């Protein structure tokens with residue numbers, strides 16, 4: 001297993017070195033989005049939590065296609081405020097309930113070290 005703790009202060013530096021295969025060794029869900037919300041990376045732990053097949057969601061828009069329950073001021077609204085500002089670091093609890101059993105999770109959104117990319121980390125609560 002890859003040893004990185006959910007919510008670590010330097011998580012973006014640690015994950016910058018990770019290929020899709022190493023991202024799959026994380027103890028929590030990790031999704032990398034571009035500024036428009038398109039999925040660039042989606043790890044195995046995230047698929048375990050949500051039921052989505054990782055390879056199938058890459059390239060889809062997270063807010064429009066995959067996760068409509070997140071299209072709200074409380075999730076997507078925070079993401080879009082962060083992209084526009086060029087800075088994002090927020091953690092909050094949320095319930096995923098689209099085409100799945102309602103599941104309570106802790107979400108951490110953070111701007112990646114890379115230019116136009118943002119991370120969404122997820123763990124069960």
Ligand SMILES: *C(=O)/C=C/c1ccc(O)cc1
Nearest residue numbers: 050067068069070096098
């Ligand atoms: C609500 O529509 C949430 C859906 C969802 C959350 C996280 C995922 O990775 C996939 C779908």
